[PDB]
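Posting here for the record, re: nickel (II) ion.
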Amino acid sequence: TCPFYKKIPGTGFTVDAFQYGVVEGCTAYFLTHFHSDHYAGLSKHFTFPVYCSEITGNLLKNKLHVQEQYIHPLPLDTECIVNGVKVVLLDANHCPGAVMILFYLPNGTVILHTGDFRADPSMERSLLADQKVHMLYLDTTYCSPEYTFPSQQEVIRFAINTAFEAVTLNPHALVVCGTYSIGKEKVFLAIADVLGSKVGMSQEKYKTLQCLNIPEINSLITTDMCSSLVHLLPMMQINFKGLQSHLKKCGGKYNQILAFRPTGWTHSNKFTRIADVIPQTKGNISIYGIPYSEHSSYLEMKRFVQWLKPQKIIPTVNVGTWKSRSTMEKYFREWKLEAGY
Ligand code: NI
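Prediction output follows.
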Protein backbone atom coordinates (compact mmCIF):
# COMPACT_ATOMS: atom_id res chain seq x y z
CA THR A 1 0.00 0.00 0.00
CA CYS A 2 1.04 3.50 -0.93
CA PRO A 3 2.87 5.41 1.79
CA PHE A 4 1.53 8.78 2.95
CA TYR A 5 4.63 10.72 1.80
CA LYS A 6 3.69 9.82 -1.86
CA LYS A 7 0.23 11.33 -1.59
CA ILE A 8 -0.67 15.06 -2.19
CA PRO A 9 -3.51 16.04 0.22
CA GLY A 10 -6.55 17.82 -1.17
CA THR A 11 -5.98 16.43 -4.57
CA GLY A 12 -6.45 13.26 -6.59
CA PHE A 13 -2.65 13.12 -7.06
CA THR A 14 0.24 10.78 -6.29
CA VAL A 15 4.02 11.25 -6.94
CA ASP A 16 6.32 8.34 -7.95
CA ALA A 17 3.66 5.73 -6.91
CA PHE A 18 3.41 3.10 -9.70
CA GLN A 19 4.23 -0.13 -7.69
CA TYR A 20 1.09 -0.21 -5.47
CA GLY A 21 -1.57 -1.17 -8.08
CA VAL A 22 -4.61 1.08 -8.47
CA VAL A 23 -4.26 3.67 -5.75
CA GLU A 24 -7.67 4.49 -4.25
CA GLY A 25 -8.79 8.00 -5.13
CA CYS A 26 -5.96 8.72 -7.60
CA THR A 27 -6.93 10.53 -10.78
CA ALA A 28 -3.43 11.51 -12.04
CA TYR A 29 -0.04 9.89 -11.38
CA PHE A 30 2.98 12.20 -11.55
CA LEU A 31 6.52 10.87 -12.34
CA THR A 32 9.39 13.15 -11.28
CA HIS A 33 12.16 11.33 -13.30
CA PHE A 34 13.14 8.15 -15.05
CA HIS A 35 15.01 6.24 -12.22
CA SER A 36 13.82 2.63 -11.48
CA ASP A 37 12.95 3.11 -7.74
CA HIS A 38 10.55 5.90 -8.94
CA TYR A 39 9.02 4.39 -12.13
CA ALA A 40 8.76 0.79 -10.64
CA GLY A 41 5.45 -0.59 -11.94
CA LEU A 42 4.97 1.27 -15.26
CA SER A 43 4.64 -0.69 -18.57
CA LYS A 44 2.61 -0.81 -21.88
CA HIS A 45 -0.44 -2.03 -19.84
CA PHE A 46 -0.68 1.13 -17.71
CA THR A 47 -3.99 2.94 -18.55
CA PHE A 48 -4.13 5.98 -16.15
CA PRO A 49 -2.89 9.53 -17.04
CA VAL A 50 0.88 10.03 -16.29
CA TYR A 51 2.13 13.56 -15.96
CA CYS A 52 5.87 14.31 -16.47
CA SER A 53 8.49 16.24 -18.40
CA GLU A 54 8.96 15.87 -22.18
CA ILE A 55 12.19 13.96 -21.70
CA THR A 56 10.64 11.58 -19.19
CA GLY A 57 7.72 11.03 -21.56
CA ASN A 58 10.18 10.12 -24.45
CA LEU A 59 11.70 7.45 -22.15
CA LEU A 60 8.27 6.07 -21.05
CA LYS A 61 7.16 5.67 -24.77
CA ASN A 62 10.49 4.22 -26.10
CA LYS A 63 11.95 2.23 -23.18
CA LEU A 64 8.87 1.04 -21.26
CA HIS A 65 6.37 1.22 -24.28
CA VAL A 66 3.75 3.12 -22.39
CA GLN A 67 1.07 4.11 -24.92
CA GLU A 68 1.07 7.68 -26.15
CA GLN A 69 -2.57 8.39 -25.27
CA TYR A 70 -1.72 8.04 -21.49
CA ILE A 71 1.48 10.24 -21.52
CA HIS A 72 0.91 13.90 -20.65
CA PRO A 73 4.19 15.83 -21.00
CA LEU A 74 4.24 19.41 -19.50
CA PRO A 75 6.60 22.24 -20.43
CA LEU A 76 8.85 23.53 -17.65
CA ASP A 77 8.47 26.92 -15.88
CA THR A 78 4.84 27.22 -17.13
CA GLU A 79 1.54 27.33 -15.13
CA CYS A 80 -0.63 24.38 -16.18
CA ILE A 81 -4.06 23.13 -14.98
CA VAL A 82 -4.35 19.42 -14.18
CA ASN A 83 -7.77 18.09 -13.13
CA GLY A 84 -8.68 21.47 -11.81
CA VAL A 85 -5.44 22.22 -9.91
CA LYS A 86 -2.63 24.65 -10.95
CA VAL A 87 0.84 22.97 -11.18
CA VAL A 88 4.32 24.02 -12.33
CA LEU A 89 7.32 21.77 -13.21
CA LEU A 90 10.79 23.10 -12.30
CA ASP A 91 14.27 21.78 -13.20
CA ALA A 92 15.55 19.55 -10.35
CA ASN A 93 19.29 19.62 -11.28
CA HIS A 94 19.24 15.77 -11.01
CA CYS A 95 19.35 13.61 -14.20
CA PRO A 96 17.97 14.56 -17.63
CA GLY A 97 14.22 15.25 -17.51
CA ALA A 98 14.06 15.34 -13.68
CA VAL A 99 11.60 17.86 -12.19
CA MET A 100 10.33 19.34 -8.90
CA ILE A 101 6.51 19.89 -8.81
CA LEU A 102 4.73 22.99 -7.33
CA PHE A 103 1.04 22.32 -6.47
CA TYR A 104 -1.32 25.28 -5.79
CA LEU A 105 -4.18 23.66 -3.77
CA PRO A 106 -7.72 24.88 -4.07
CA ASN A 107 -7.75 26.02 -0.40
CA GLY A 108 -4.60 28.32 -0.77
CA THR A 109 -1.94 25.83 0.45
CA VAL A 110 1.19 25.67 -1.71
CA ILE A 111 3.21 22.36 -1.76
CA LEU A 112 6.72 21.81 -3.31
CA HIS A 113 7.69 18.15 -4.05
CA THR A 114 11.46 18.17 -4.88
CA GLY A 115 11.52 14.63 -6.36
CA ASP A 116 15.25 13.84 -6.43
CA PHE A 117 17.32 17.09 -6.61
CA ARG A 118 20.69 18.72 -6.18
CA ALA A 119 19.89 22.11 -4.57
CA ASP A 120 21.45 25.12 -6.18
CA PRO A 121 21.34 28.95 -5.53
CA SER A 122 19.94 29.31 -9.10
CA MET A 123 16.67 27.84 -7.79
CA GLU A 124 16.28 30.98 -5.54
CA ARG A 125 15.42 32.85 -8.88
CA SER A 126 12.98 30.43 -10.39
CA LEU A 127 9.14 30.74 -9.98
CA LEU A 128 9.74 29.69 -6.36
CA ALA A 129 10.80 33.33 -5.59
CA ASP A 130 7.19 34.58 -6.19
CA GLN A 131 5.11 32.93 -3.37
CA LYS A 132 5.16 31.24 0.02
CA VAL A 133 5.42 27.36 0.35
CA HIS A 134 3.63 25.72 3.20
CA MET A 135 4.74 22.07 2.82
CA LEU A 136 8.08 20.68 1.38
CA TYR A 137 8.36 16.97 0.36
CA LEU A 138 12.19 16.89 0.53
CA ASP A 139 14.90 14.59 -1.01
CA THR A 140 16.86 13.90 2.18
CA THR A 141 19.34 11.38 0.66
CA TYR A 142 22.43 13.09 2.21
CA CYS A 143 20.81 14.80 5.20
CA SER A 144 23.82 14.58 7.67
CA PRO A 145 26.81 16.84 7.99
CA GLU A 146 29.35 14.10 7.08
CA TYR A 147 28.13 14.26 3.52
CA THR A 148 30.44 16.68 1.76
CA PHE A 149 31.48 16.46 -1.86
CA PRO A 150 32.96 18.87 -4.42
CA SER A 151 31.10 20.79 -7.17
CA GLN A 152 30.29 18.86 -10.35
CA GLN A 153 32.61 21.34 -12.22
CA GLU A 154 35.68 20.45 -9.98
CA VAL A 155 34.99 16.69 -10.48
CA ILE A 156 34.73 17.04 -14.30
CA ARG A 157 37.99 19.13 -14.32
CA PHE A 158 39.71 16.23 -12.48
CA ALA A 159 38.34 13.63 -14.87
CA ILE A 160 39.23 15.49 -18.10
CA ASN A 161 42.83 16.32 -16.86
CA THR A 162 43.36 12.65 -15.75
CA ALA A 163 42.12 11.13 -19.01
CA PHE A 164 43.95 13.67 -21.29
CA GLU A 165 47.28 13.08 -19.43
CA ALA A 166 46.97 9.24 -19.56
CA VAL A 167 46.07 9.02 -23.26
CA THR A 168 48.71 11.60 -24.32
CA LEU A 169 51.36 9.55 -22.43
CA ASN A 170 50.01 6.32 -23.99
CA PRO A 171 47.96 6.66 -27.25
CA HIS A 172 47.13 2.93 -26.92
CA ALA A 173 45.22 3.43 -23.59
CA LEU A 174 41.38 2.88 -23.61
CA VAL A 175 39.11 4.94 -21.30
CA VAL A 176 36.06 3.13 -19.81
CA CYS A 177 33.19 4.78 -17.87
CA GLY A 178 30.55 2.84 -15.84
CA THR A 179 26.75 3.54 -16.02
CA TYR A 180 23.49 1.78 -14.84
CA SER A 181 20.87 4.50 -15.24
CA ILE A 182 20.47 7.91 -16.86
CA GLY A 183 22.31 10.76 -15.20
CA LYS A 184 26.00 11.82 -14.95
CA GLU A 185 26.35 11.99 -18.81
CA LYS A 186 28.78 14.95 -18.43
CA VAL A 187 31.48 12.49 -17.14
CA PHE A 188 31.80 10.46 -20.38
CA LEU A 189 30.85 13.34 -22.75
CA ALA A 190 33.49 15.75 -21.31
CA ILE A 191 36.22 13.07 -21.49
CA ALA A 192 35.35 12.13 -25.14
CA ASP A 193 35.34 15.88 -26.10
CA VAL A 194 38.92 16.45 -24.73
CA LEU A 195 40.17 13.27 -26.54
CA GLY A 196 38.52 14.00 -29.93
CA SER A 197 36.53 10.79 -29.83
CA LYS A 198 32.88 9.65 -29.80
CA VAL A 199 31.62 7.56 -26.91
CA GLY A 200 30.99 3.95 -27.84
CA MET A 201 28.19 1.93 -26.19
CA SER A 202 25.57 -0.83 -26.60
CA GLN A 203 22.53 -0.41 -28.74
CA GLU A 204 20.24 -0.33 -25.62
CA LYS A 205 22.27 2.56 -24.06
CA TYR A 206 22.45 4.48 -27.37
CA LYS A 207 18.62 4.18 -27.59
CA THR A 208 18.26 5.64 -24.03
CA LEU A 209 20.55 8.57 -24.80
CA GLN A 210 18.67 9.37 -28.00
CA CYS A 211 15.55 10.13 -25.84
CA LEU A 212 17.31 12.94 -23.84
CA ASN A 213 17.25 16.10 -26.05
CA ILE A 214 20.96 16.65 -25.61
CA PRO A 215 22.19 19.12 -28.34
CA GLU A 216 24.46 17.76 -31.02
CA ILE A 217 24.18 14.19 -29.58
CA ASN A 218 24.56 12.51 -33.01
CA SER A 219 28.06 14.20 -33.03
CA LEU A 220 29.07 12.76 -29.60
CA ILE A 221 27.96 9.06 -29.26
CA THR A 222 28.08 5.88 -31.43
CA THR A 223 27.42 2.12 -31.43
CA ASP A 224 30.65 1.53 -33.35
CA MET A 225 32.97 0.52 -30.57
CA CYS A 226 35.98 0.07 -32.91
CA SER A 227 36.01 3.72 -33.90
CA SER A 228 35.86 5.00 -30.25
CA LEU A 229 38.47 5.24 -27.46
CA VAL A 230 35.93 6.05 -24.70
CA HIS A 231 33.65 3.06 -23.98
CA LEU A 232 30.60 2.86 -21.73
CA LEU A 233 29.99 -0.36 -19.82
CA PRO A 234 27.57 -1.47 -17.16
CA MET A 235 28.62 -0.37 -13.63
CA MET A 236 28.86 -4.04 -12.56
CA GLN A 237 31.63 -4.65 -15.09
CA ILE A 238 33.88 -1.85 -13.61
CA ASN A 239 36.24 -4.22 -11.68
CA PHE A 240 39.57 -5.87 -12.61
CA LYS A 241 38.02 -9.14 -13.93
CA GLY A 242 35.40 -7.27 -15.99
CA LEU A 243 37.90 -4.85 -17.47
CA GLN A 244 40.54 -7.55 -18.28
CA SER A 245 37.81 -9.35 -20.26
CA HIS A 246 36.80 -6.23 -22.13
CA LEU A 247 40.45 -5.50 -23.06
CA LYS A 248 40.65 -9.02 -24.59
CA LYS A 249 37.70 -8.17 -26.85
CA CYS A 250 39.40 -5.14 -28.39
CA GLY A 251 41.80 -7.35 -30.40
CA GLY A 252 45.13 -5.80 -29.42
CA LYS A 253 44.13 -2.24 -30.31
CA TYR A 254 44.74 -1.30 -26.69
CA ASN A 255 47.25 -2.23 -23.99
CA GLN A 256 46.01 -0.25 -20.90
CA ILE A 257 42.57 0.71 -19.37
CA LEU A 258 41.83 3.82 -17.35
CA ALA A 259 38.27 3.40 -15.85
CA PHE A 260 35.91 5.75 -13.98
CA ARG A 261 33.12 4.80 -11.46
CA PRO A 262 31.04 8.00 -10.78
CA THR A 263 29.67 7.00 -7.36
CA GLY A 264 27.76 9.48 -5.14
CA TRP A 265 29.44 9.80 -1.72
CA THR A 266 32.01 7.35 -0.32
CA HIS A 267 33.78 7.92 3.19
CA SER A 268 37.07 8.63 1.36
CA ASN A 269 35.21 12.10 1.15
CA LYS A 270 35.62 12.73 4.93
CA PHE A 271 39.46 12.67 4.65
CA THR A 272 40.59 13.45 1.08
CA ARG A 273 40.35 16.40 -1.40
CA ILE A 274 39.45 15.84 -5.09
CA ALA A 275 42.98 16.91 -6.05
CA ASP A 276 44.36 14.07 -3.87
CA VAL A 277 42.19 11.16 -5.32
CA ILE A 278 44.17 8.09 -6.50
CA PRO A 279 43.06 4.95 -8.31
CA GLN A 280 43.09 1.26 -7.48
CA THR A 281 45.59 -0.38 -9.86
CA LYS A 282 46.33 -3.98 -10.99
CA GLY A 283 48.79 -4.49 -13.83
CA ASN A 284 47.75 -2.28 -16.80
CA ILE A 285 44.23 -1.48 -15.31
CA SER A 286 43.50 1.54 -13.10
CA ILE A 287 39.99 2.36 -11.56
CA TYR A 288 39.08 5.81 -10.20
CA GLY A 289 36.04 6.31 -7.92
CA ILE A 290 34.96 9.90 -8.48
CA PRO A 291 32.37 11.69 -6.18
CA TYR A 292 30.07 13.04 -8.90
CA SER A 293 26.71 13.63 -7.09
CA GLU A 294 23.27 14.41 -8.53
CA HIS A 295 21.87 14.89 -4.99
CA SER A 296 22.27 17.82 -2.57
CA SER A 297 25.18 17.87 -0.12
CA TYR A 298 24.16 18.57 3.47
CA LEU A 299 25.17 22.24 3.15
CA GLU A 300 23.37 22.76 -0.21
CA MET A 301 20.20 21.21 1.27
CA LYS A 302 20.38 23.34 4.44
CA ARG A 303 20.85 26.58 2.40
CA PHE A 304 17.81 25.78 0.17
CA VAL A 305 15.52 24.99 3.11
CA GLN A 306 16.65 28.07 5.19
CA TRP A 307 15.90 30.23 2.05
CA LEU A 308 12.50 28.64 1.34
CA LYS A 309 11.30 28.72 5.01
CA PRO A 310 8.61 26.00 4.73
CA GLN A 311 6.07 25.54 7.55
CA LYS A 312 6.31 21.73 7.43
CA ILE A 313 8.96 19.26 5.99
CA ILE A 314 8.11 15.73 4.86
CA PRO A 315 11.27 13.66 4.09
CA THR A 316 11.04 11.25 1.12
CA VAL A 317 14.42 9.38 1.66
CA ASN A 318 15.88 7.54 4.69
CA VAL A 319 12.31 7.17 6.15
CA GLY A 320 12.51 3.46 7.05
CA THR A 321 14.35 3.63 10.41
CA TRP A 322 13.52 5.49 13.63
CA LYS A 323 17.15 6.58 14.06
CA SER A 324 17.26 8.14 10.56
CA ARG A 325 13.89 9.89 11.07
CA SER A 326 14.92 11.29 14.48
CA THR A 327 18.33 12.51 13.08
CA MET A 328 16.62 14.36 10.19
CA GLU A 329 13.99 15.98 12.50
CA LYS A 330 16.75 17.28 14.75
CA TYR A 331 18.50 18.96 11.80
CA PHE A 332 15.24 20.51 10.56
CA ARG A 333 14.75 22.09 14.02
CA GLU A 334 18.29 23.35 14.16
CA TRP A 335 17.86 25.00 10.74
CA LYS A 336 14.65 26.69 11.71
CA LEU A 337 16.07 28.00 15.10
CA GLU A 338 19.23 29.36 13.40
CA ALA A 339 17.30 31.19 10.60
CA GLY A 340 14.31 32.37 12.71
CA TYR A 341 11.27 31.03 10.78
NI1 NI B 1 16.98 9.61 -8.86
